Every structure is written in structure tokens, then in C-alpha cells.
Design an enzyme around this catalytic site. Sequence first.
Site, PDB file in Angstrom:
ATOM      1  CB  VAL A  57      -0.985  -0.024   1.177  1.00 24.21           C
ATOM      2  CG1 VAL A  57      -1.816   1.235   1.167  1.00 24.21           C
ATOM      3  CG2 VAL A  57      -1.881  -1.256   1.098  1.00 24.21           C
ATOM      4  CG  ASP A  58       2.697   3.105   3.424  1.00 22.12           C
ATOM      5  OD1 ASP A  58       1.597   3.621   3.138  1.00 22.12           O
ATOM      6  OD2 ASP A  58       3.169   3.091   4.582  1.00 22.12           O
ATOM      7  CB  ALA A  59       4.905   0.090  -2.728  1.00 22.71           C
TER       8      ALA A  59
END
Lengths: 134, 57, 76, 77
Positions: C58-60
Site C-alpha cells: 500500500v505505501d509502495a
Amino acid sequence: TYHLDVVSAEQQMFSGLVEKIQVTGSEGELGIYPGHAPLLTAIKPGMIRIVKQHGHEEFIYLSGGILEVQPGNVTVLADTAIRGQDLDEARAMEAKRKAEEHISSSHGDVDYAQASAELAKAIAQLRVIELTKK
Amino acid sequence: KFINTMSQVPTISQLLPLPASDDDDLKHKSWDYLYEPDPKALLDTLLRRYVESQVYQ
Amino acid sequence: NLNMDLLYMAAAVMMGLAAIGAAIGIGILGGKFLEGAARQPDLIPLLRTQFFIVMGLVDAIPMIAVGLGLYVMFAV
Amino acid sequence: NLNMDLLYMAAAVMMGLAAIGAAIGIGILGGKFLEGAARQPDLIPLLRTQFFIVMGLVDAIPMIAVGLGLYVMFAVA
């Protein structure tokens, strides 16, 4: 861990402490743990896996029932249940024969509602007899 | 009621309303319950089996 | 001149929409953790592990947009 | 000159998008807490700890955006 009691109007099917169980439910099969979600439900035609201390499973047919897992004493109530070696793999393959014959011998909606339950009983037997081999 | 092979006791007890005189499950009060969807049917059908079981036994 | 205020504006559109993306995808993801946590409380340490596995996915992309938002802003 | 007015405009859109993302992201997460506390208040001390463990990572990126909006508005000016 937690204590499981399983009964039917014909017999007490199991009772004792158990480490995990995987159990039929209303929408789908369900996994149980110590302190699992405190839930009551109806169950589909199916079975329960009884993994005891030292990791030993046993397999119980659950043709129909209602369950409770809220207390540390949990409970399955079975409208019909059969112990996993009183049923046999050959008996469930015969169950397939009846279900498939009545599918060919059912032609309305009301008789399909019974032939569908006769099928579900056979299919749930055909499931537990394979699981029984583990 | 069959309390002994040669002694039995006459008894009367209430089924409905399912008596709140009986204990709350206070040991398991931390685990306060979650209904499965369609809680009316699941609760009614379960209680029908309860009274059916109490009368037949 | 005009060149610099348009860079501060373009960093503001990358580093804002990364703030929508990293925020709502972890509300959707972490709300399903909490109901699963309320459901299997002894499994919370097991479910929390998988929450960090998927949180890295998700944060990537929001961290690419935040790394370029600081580049456009400060390093050019 | 015109550059400062567009820097106030840049800090405003950056902090506004941060304000939407961080506040809708904690309203979802906290709504799941309040249902699981409604289910069982005995887990209010236990969930409210997982709540803050998760709510730190929600506010990870919006406080980079607020930290750079404040920098634009007060130090690029």
C-alpha cells in the site's frame, strides 16, 4: 484450551477439551480457536475436524445443526450427526448414487427442494469420507 | 422424575418465559456475543429445539 | 520568476494525492484488521504480521510520489 | 510579487489534501474500533491500543505534507 460438547437427540457425539476445530457454518466453513469470536449460528450440511492434544484429528459428519462458541464450554447441536467410522467411503459413494438418481427423477420445484437436500447429504458425506483418510 | 430404581419424585418446572432466575454466564462475560445474520430465525429455531428437548426428555 | 512557483505547485499535487492514497488505503486495510482483531483476539499477533506485509505494498507507490515531491521541491 | 501568492496557494492545497486524507482515514479506522468495542467493551483497553498502533501509520504521510505546507507558508513565504 477450550472444551467442546457435541450432541444429538440420538447420542452424545463428542465431549472434551480440544485445541482447534474447523466447522461448517451458514455462509461457509469456519475456523475456531481459544477465545474465538463469541458467535451462534446455523450450519450447512458438512462436517467438523476435531484436532485434540498432541495434534490428533478426528472427523465427525454434521448433516444438520446449530452451534454456539461464546463460552469456554463451546457446543454443537446436531439434528443429525454420524461418527466418522460408522459411516464409510463406500456408503457415501452409494449416497452419490441416490442423489444422482433423484436428480434424474425430480422434475418440479417442490421435489427439487427435497432432491437438493438429498444431494447435499450425499455431497457432505462424500466430503468427510475423504477427510477421514487423514 | 427417576431419582432411584425404587424411588421417584413428582416435579413441576417452568419452560416459558425461559427463566432469568437461571445464572448469567459471568465467567464468560468478557465474551459477549455476536449474532450471525438472520438472528431472529437462528434464535427462534434454536429455542424451539430447546422446548422440544425439555418436553421430550 | 514564474518557474519556481509552478514547481511548488507541482510538488503540492504529488504530495497531496499521495496523502489521499496512503491515508484511505490504510483506513480500508486497518479497519479490516480491527474487526479481525475483535474477532480473533489471540490471533492479533498473527494478523498484525500480515497487516505489515500488505502495508508495505500500500505505501509502495505513495512513497515514490513523496520522494519526488521532495525532489521537485528542494533538489531542483 | 506573484510568487508568494502562489506559494500560499500551494501550501493551502497541500494542507487541504492532507486534511481530507488524514481525517477520513482515521474516521474509518475508528468506526471499526467503536463497532468492536460495541461488540465487547472488555476489549476497549485492548483494541484502543491496536487503534493507536495503527493510527500512527495513518498519520505518517499527512504530517510530511503538513510539515512541508508549514515550511512553504512560513519559510519560503
